[PDB]
Amino acid sequence: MRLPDPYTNPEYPGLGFESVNLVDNDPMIRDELPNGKVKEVKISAQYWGINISYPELFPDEYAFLDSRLLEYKRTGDYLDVLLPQYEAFRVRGDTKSVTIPAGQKGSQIILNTNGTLTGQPKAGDLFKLSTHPKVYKITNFSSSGNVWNISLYPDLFITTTGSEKPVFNGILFRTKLMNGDSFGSTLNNNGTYSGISLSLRESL
Amino acid sequence: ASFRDFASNNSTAFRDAVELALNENGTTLKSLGNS
Amino acid sequence: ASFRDFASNNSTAFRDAVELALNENGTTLKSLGNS
Amino acid sequence: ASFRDFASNNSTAFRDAVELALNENGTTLKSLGNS
Amino acid sequence: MKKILDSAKNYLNTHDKLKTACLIALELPSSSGSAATYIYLTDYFRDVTYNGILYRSGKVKSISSHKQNRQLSIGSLSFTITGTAEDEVLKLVQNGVSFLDRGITIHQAIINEEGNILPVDPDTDGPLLFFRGRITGGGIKDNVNTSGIGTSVITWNCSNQFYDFDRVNGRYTDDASHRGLEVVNGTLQPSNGAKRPEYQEDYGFFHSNKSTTILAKYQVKEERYKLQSKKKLFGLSRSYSLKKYYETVTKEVDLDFNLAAKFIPVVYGVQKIPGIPIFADTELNNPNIVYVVYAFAEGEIDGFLDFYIGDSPMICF
Amino acid sequence: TTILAKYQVKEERYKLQSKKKLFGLSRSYSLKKYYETVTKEVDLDFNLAAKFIPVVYGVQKIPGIPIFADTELNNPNIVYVVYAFAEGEIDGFLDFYIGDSPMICFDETDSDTRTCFGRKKIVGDTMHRLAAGTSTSQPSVHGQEYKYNDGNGDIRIWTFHGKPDQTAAQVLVDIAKKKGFYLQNQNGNGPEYWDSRYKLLDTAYAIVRFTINENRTEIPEISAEVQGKKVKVYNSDGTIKADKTSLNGIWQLMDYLTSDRYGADITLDQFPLQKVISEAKILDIIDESYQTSWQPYWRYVGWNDPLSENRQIVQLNTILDTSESVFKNVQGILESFGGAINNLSGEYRITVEKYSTNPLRINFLDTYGDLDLSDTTGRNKFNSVQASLVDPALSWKTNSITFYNSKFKEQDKGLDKKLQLSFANITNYYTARSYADRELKKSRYSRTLSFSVPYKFIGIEPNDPIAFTYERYGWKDKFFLVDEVENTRDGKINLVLQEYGEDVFINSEQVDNSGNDIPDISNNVLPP
Amino acid sequence: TILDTSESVFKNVQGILESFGGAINNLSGEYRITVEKYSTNPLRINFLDTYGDLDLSDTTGRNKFNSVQASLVDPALSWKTNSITFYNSKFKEQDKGLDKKLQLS
């Protein structure tokens, strides 16, 4: 499901992140050798962590927000979020006619736009495959005409099967709440819910 | 370390905790009076 | 104190820690099934 | 938990703490070499 | 008192900051016994050359404490390798490889101002020995944390020659054990399992299985299948009580259900021991003349002082 | 016992042979202590554990506990003594040891030393030859009288098998009816001395009648070779076959576990029949290492027909000293064929070690991230094995099986390390040799692994085949067997795997020890 | 001595020792055999040379005896057991006349 925000529900401008913390969580078997060399082995999967802080929420906005959150807690599905700082539409066009040749594993990826896309995805922008819900981060870009060579920080979780389509816009993190067990909201005498915050965490 | 003194002040608990894992099988610590 | 409950929740570790100091010499706790 | 490693680093203390509660009565752990 | 060079006795007394390195040399676990490869390692930050051997660094992480009491016990030591080398991991986790009797020697080296090894041991004019024994055990501990830093530790286990305290090394009076018989294709052929290569054509214990039954015909109804205990008194310690100790002592054992009574003892000094029959047969035309062979003791003995035919020695008191 | 002692030697006056000679050598014993504890005879005046009734599965030799002894009135030298052999409905008595010499002599060597009938070697003659007079290789008949005269006196047996509805012996009832018993008249008792109430239900026994005369002046110690209690063998289709005893270990354990008369009363409801049936066939796998012709004492090792296969991988002829605890008796029945009673998932499940071509594939990424490897090669890895067993080829004495391995000693730099074993429930020499070889092979894989898996994969039980695949090591579908499984209520399963190999379950070729049997033709006076 | 080879190597070595003292030591590399002895030039340790910790423990009970009784297989007899028993008047003048016997074999 979709986390409410001013893009989906413009009538509630109180929704919307006062501050978002996009943390990098890659567990590693780090070992500090006696000779000064540091050896680290990556085994556990990496996952983005999102910490959302909300401004002063009025009672109706908080009613909508916690209604959506409680529906999340009820039906048990995943909770998608859209970070707005990465919503710079730097790539126009429709990506259905873009083919990613099969048999690709690792950070590097090669995709052929077939002369369809307009706009260059600069480093630091987000990237997501059509099938898998993992969200990557472009670290370097290099194109030779139509073919694009993109390097992603997390290695491709699944090897491309030749049908996965690039998603350069409207990327949603498939996250799970981490504050659900004890989630309280305080109501002031001024009439606003203060200090509403979420500690999300990408699942899979 | 200073763990020896402590354990020496809680010996019966150690005995019971030991005899509780030997009773999983048919062993027990009350079979030492014979020997 | 409340150490008894804890030890009763970790009995196998106590058994192993005991049998690890008896194996220093030729003694072992698997010699109780006879008696 | 991580208590197993610790106990494995203090085994002799466990042995002594055990043998200190068996000496209350006439039992002792030095009677295992026979068996 | 392990004597130390007087030159080292001055350095160990004047200098406060001592730079010490432990030089480890373990034998590689190999599938077969052919050859003898050694990995040389050190705990120091730089490689250390000793007797022309380069002890490479960067693998060893920690070494345990060697403790020795006045009661016989296995001397256990535990040194840990990094476990992320991925070249030491495969040696430990390799399939079809055994390290039952692979040794390890650890030296305690002190570094000088110029970076050399301060001579300590008088006989070698080099560093002291911290531990030398056998590799009995091992393991690796992977700990992958879903958030944070994980660790992996490879720990090698070491001990002296008495690691297997439940080990009975003896020459049981039997042909199959004496010559190390093993089926090779379709026959029981002697192998290298014999304690000596010259034991492969020794048929001395060939008729030991039927010796007792044949001998029993010429004995009393009692003592038909019996033998005196080789050791009567064995030692009264805190492991026994007076009643139990003096009740356990036995005089005679039945040979039809005591396979421990057919082991060959070893005697130092003048002691009385029973004889284990290994052959018994009569003459053809004189059936009342019976030859019976008793195996007394082990090894090159000085000789037999006296023989007790029954309970009366040939040489009277 | 006191009445019987009058007609015995000064020695063996109050004595009885131990029901179980060898019981099992494990890490709880040492060689010297284990082989010193084994006893041959026990005094009946201070050993109340010697008056318990044993239960026998398969062909085994057991002593007889007297329960009645009295002479005739006008013929005081004719004494009736009743010995209770074994428990439950037994197939029958194979042979009777009047003293230390069986009625059916071993072979040609034992025939020329005394008056005997038939041969136990090759021919496999049984006691029923005494009544039939022909070559018979099947057990006795319930309530039939047998006459055995070796030239020193007449002996009559009247074998009785166990049955739920035994009737009182007609011979003793007839003697007691006419006031024929000597102590019956001494104490003034009437026909109630022995009546129809003396049913002796669920207990096999024999009423051996002695004619003490100039030659047999003493009553010798009586022992018998029973064929064992009949067990229920469950078939896959659904039919139930309980007509003969079975050498399969699982059926013997199932009989011991579902009996409220002796042992624990575990109802057949608390048992998955299909799993037990499938696991029995694992112990029923035909071994091809040796030949059926190589065992001349085929009748007395549990087999019934030399023509048939009778080459199961594990065959057990067991004696259960009922004076032992139920827990220890079950623990002793197991460890003779592997076995692990499991109470997980509700029922009682019997699992034995086996190799599978379709194990469950666990990758390390499916675990919880923890992993503990532990290989204790010291104290657990051996290069040669030495075992012992009670072999009916000898006069039920102990035979040692010893062999070395050149490959395992080429490895380990020629170190001499011997595995010491002792089989209590195995009597076939070739089966014991195969089991010792299996144990020696299994000792070379001493390496265990522990990790946790999520709620999925629920259903893992001990002795299950699992293929581990951890790419960081050189592991791709490595064979493991479950050793410890722990279920939590929050859906986490803790496992401890044990490394195995394929070679553990292949059988190496062996030779025949048929010519190395040593019958005890001693203990009797040779004729002129 | 008679060494019943059916015993374990560990127990056989442990039995050979304790007959003359003895302590097999694997420290400093080699196997060293040390027996109890008195020396006129021992190594002098002052407490200021230590790390500051010190534990004194005297278990006079269960370890202090006034008389000894031993047994042995003596070839003077027909290899039977002979008992050696003697008392000490000084050790019983101490300890307030308590009767405590050491049993040995």
Curated annotation (Swiss-Prot), chain A:
Key words, A-Z? Late protein, Viral tail protein, Virion
* Gene Ontology cellular-component terms listed: virus tail; virus tail, baseplate
InterPro entries named in the record: DTP-pb9_A-dom_C, DTP-pb9_A-dom_N, DTP-pb9_B-dom
Q: Tell me which Pfam families the record gives.
A: DTP-pb9_A-dom_C, DTP-pb9_A-dom_N, DTP-pb9_B-dom
What subcellular locations does the record give?
Answer: Virion
| Segments passing through the bilayer | none
Q: What is its main location?
A: virion
Q: Does the keyword Signal apply?
A: no
- What's the entry's take on its domains? Possesses OB-fold domains probably serving host adhesion properties.
Purpose:
Forms the simplified baseplate, together with the p132 collar protein, the baseplate tube protein p140 and baseplate hub protein pb3.
Subunit (UniProt): Homohexamer. Interacts with baseplate tube protein p140 and baseplate hub protein pb3.
Q: What is this protein called?
A: Distal tail protein pb9
Q: Which organism is it from?
A: Escherichia phage T5
What is the phylogenetic placement of the source species in the record? Answer: Viruses, Duplodnaviria, Heunggongvirae, Uroviricota, Caudoviricetes
From Swiss-Prot, chains B, C, D:
Whichever gene encodes this chain, its name is D18-19
Q: Which source organism? A: Escherichia phage T5 (Enterobacteria phage T5)
What job does the chain carry out? Displays an exolysin activity that is probably involved in the fusion with the host membrane and in the host peptidoglycan digestion necessary for viral DNA entry into the host cell.
Tell me the leader sequence span: none
Localization per record: Virion
- Judging by the UniProt lineage, the source's domain of life is Viruses
Name listed for the protein in its UniProt record: Exolysin
Q: Which reaction does it catalyse?
A: Exolytic cleavage of the (1->4)-beta-glycosidic linkage between N-acetylmuramic acid (MurNAc) and N-acetylglucosamine (GlcNAc) residues in peptidoglycan, from either the reducing or the non-reducing ends of the peptidoglycan chains, with concomitant formation of a 1,6-anhydrobond in the MurNAc residue
Curated annotation (Swiss-Prot), chain F:
Q: Does the keyword Cell membrane apply?
A: no
- Tell me the keywords, alphabetical order: Late protein, Ubl conjugation, Viral baseplate protein, Viral tail protein, Virion
Q: Which domain of life is it from?
A: Viruses
Gene induction:
Expressed in the late phase of the viral replicative cycle.
Role according to the record: Forms the simplified baseplate, together with the p132 collar protein, the baseplate tube protein p140 and distal tail protein pb9. Closes the tail tube and, upon infection, opens to form a channel thereby anchoring the tube to the outer membrane. These changes allow the tape measure protein pb2 to be expelled and phage DNA to be transferred to the host. Also forms the start of the central straight fiber, which is continued with the straight fiber protein pb4.
GO terms for cellular component = virus tail; virus tail, baseplate
Write out the PTM section of this UniProt entry: Ubiquitinated by the Bil antiviral defense system when this protein is expressed in E.coli MG1655 strain expressing the Bil system.
This one is known as Baseplate hub protein pb3
Q: Where in the cell is it found?
A: Virion
- Residues included from the entire protein: 212 to 739 of 949
Where does the sequence pass through the membrane? Answer: none
**The protein's assembly and partners:** Homotrimer. Forms a pseudo-hexameric ring. Interacts with distal tail protein pb9 and straight fiber protein pb4.
- Its gene? D16
Swiss-Prot record, chain G:
| Compartments where found | Virion
Q: Which residues form a coiled coil?
A: none
Induction cue? Expressed in the late phase of the viral replicative cycle.
Recount the PTM note: Ubiquitinated by the Bil antiviral defense system when this protein is expressed in E.coli MG1655 strain expressing the Bil system.
Q: What does this protein do?
A: Forms the simplified baseplate, together with the p132 collar protein, the baseplate tube protein p140 and distal tail protein pb9. Closes the tail tube and, upon infection, opens to form a channel thereby anchoring the tube to the outer membrane. These changes allow the tape measure protein pb2 to be expelled and phage DNA to be transferred to the host. Also forms the start of the central straight fiber, which is continued with the straight fiber protein pb4.
Oligomer status and interactors: Homotrimer. Forms a pseudo-hexameric ring. Interacts with distal tail protein pb9 and straight fiber protein pb4.
| Name assigned to this protein | Baseplate hub protein pb3
What organism is listed for this UniProt entry? Escherichia phage T5 (Enterobacteria phage T5)
Q: Which residues of the full protein are shown?
A: 529 to 633 of 949
